[PDB]
Structure 1
């Protein structure tokens, strides 16, 4: 597509003119041993987040980051990674946020790739520094708490966590604590991100996708906001709704539940 590429296409374009392959994951230890030939790495925690404030980097920082890494405005960017391509989808969203036009996701991420047995490289990579200039933030695709609060009833609210997180039965996936209140935003619909993807990690057809979200009760006549626990899994769904099925107004609530379930006085709904 114009926003998605297949492993085959990727394989056959490893070293094509103005095309940069970038690996995104929250750890980056996977890249420091095996990665697509020519690929560079962005560490989600250490490169894309603020060191002090609960926030991701701003325009000026984003520009210095990409410059230092050799990404140019006119490059076509291919994103891919582990953890079900979650953070690749998070990066995809950061990119669109700062106005990058030619950005494409790699269907399946680092997991379809490894499964097809495609060649990986362990050779260090460094590109000549560029002169990248980000656009001021496009908040048409970002939701902040207040507008998240102001929604409720007004908008499709899509909770992409697991059912047990959604119902409030559990606070977080499997590892530990996150807010201090369990549950979801009143009115919210539970489509665990996972349903939008095949066993191998690739996105499902627009036919399967429309069905999935129709069945769950997504109101096509309403504007939509997606949320997760840390925006993690929500930017993956955002990409699905806006980029694949092409809804016009879809925001990612990056704050997600870690913020929401910690706000005092905010409405909450238990159960399913």
Structure 2
């Protein structure tokens, strides 16, 4: 259970905007928000153009990730503080990428942009450029990623946490984030991602979070995989399960329903 090491408050953040070897990184859909204004000194990662493979359906490999961080001026030894709008979803997605590629010191700004703005804390429109660095990633740690064949093999073996809306989960509605069939993975439990967050964007307490998943049916005798439509809301939930609640065996299934719901002959379950 690692809340102390993985999360920083807006209060800590504002007092540490120019602290040695700390870098703030805004991650979202596009950089429109960041280009309007941002936390002072923060740099941006574009979740679509910087972090996705432009040809294959995948995110960037270790070399592409290293090249990107080198160009943006992030070092292996920097403490990276990630934040964003769209509910800190893409910031949590980036946090998961950082851990995948072996980065040690990285944390989320609790509540992201929503909490910062709600607090009335200053934002800046000054441009930011950092001197380039030499970042070298590790090979992916696939203990935190699930692929399609292991997800199919996990049915009835691992907890499968579906963080989509209840209407998607039951298959009442199908959903660019489309698939061939509605429904969920058999045996999956539905905990819509937002149940783990407060109105102001912050994560709920360890007490609230443990109750939420225990009541929904998370089985502590089983390992776990989280999923949504694309790796997005599921990365936020992955962070909750692994980093805050301390489960050691949690994978993000980034293929998610856009993959699974398009697979020929995959088991599908309806209703709930």
Give the TM-score normalised by structure 1. 0.98
Give the Cα–Cα distance (whole angstroms) in 2 for the partners of residues 30 and 190 of structure 1: 31
Give the Cα–Cα distance (whole angstroms) in 2 for the partners of residues 254 and 123 of structure 1: 34
SS in structure 1 of the partner of residue 121 of structure 2: coil
Q: Point out where structure 2 has 5 or more consecutive residues left out of the alignment.
A: none
Give the Cα–Cα distance (whole angstroms) in 2 for the partners of residues 220 and 192 of structure 1: 19
Give the Cα–Cα distance (whole angstroms) in 2 for the partners of residues 83 and 112 of structure 1: 12
Give the Cα–Cα distance (whole angstroms) in 1 for the partners of residues 197 and 82 of structure 2: 17
Give the Cα–Cα distance (whole angstroms) in 2 for the partners of residues 33 and 83 of structure 1: 15
Q: Kindly indicate which of the two structures has a greater share of residues assigned to helix.
A: 2
Give the Cα–Cα distance (whole angstroms) in 2 for the partners of residues 4 and 94 of structure 1: 16
The offset of 1:207, in angstroms, is 0.5
Q: Deviations over 1:123-156 (max 9, x none)?
A: 0000000000000000000000000000000000
**CA RMSD after TM alignment:** 0.6
SS in structure 1 of the partner of residue 207 of structure 2: helix
Q: Deviations over 1:33-71 (max 9, x none)?
A: 110000000000000000000000000000000000000
The offset of 1:193, in angstroms, is 0.5
Give the Cα–Cα distance (whole angstroms) in 2 for the partners of residues 105 and 89 of structure 1: 7
Q: Deviations over 1:140-183 (max 9, x none)?
A: 00000000000000000000000001001112xxxxx6002001
Q: Deviations over 1:188-230 (max 9, x none)?
A: 0000001000000000110000000000000011000000000
1:81 maps to 84
Q: Point out where structure 1 has 5 or more consecutive residues left out of the alignment.
A: 172-176
Aligned residues: 267
SS in structure 2 of the partner of residue 2 of structure 1: helix
The offset of 1:265, in angstroms, is 0.3
1:174 maps to none
1:247 maps to 247
Give the Cα–Cα distance (whole angstroms) in 1 for the partners of residues 150 and 118 of structure 2: 41
SS in structure 1 of the partner of residue 150 of structure 2: helix
Give the Cα–Cα distance (whole angstroms) in 1 for the partners of residues 157 and 210 of structure 2: 21
SS in structure 1 of the partner of residue 87 of structure 2: coil
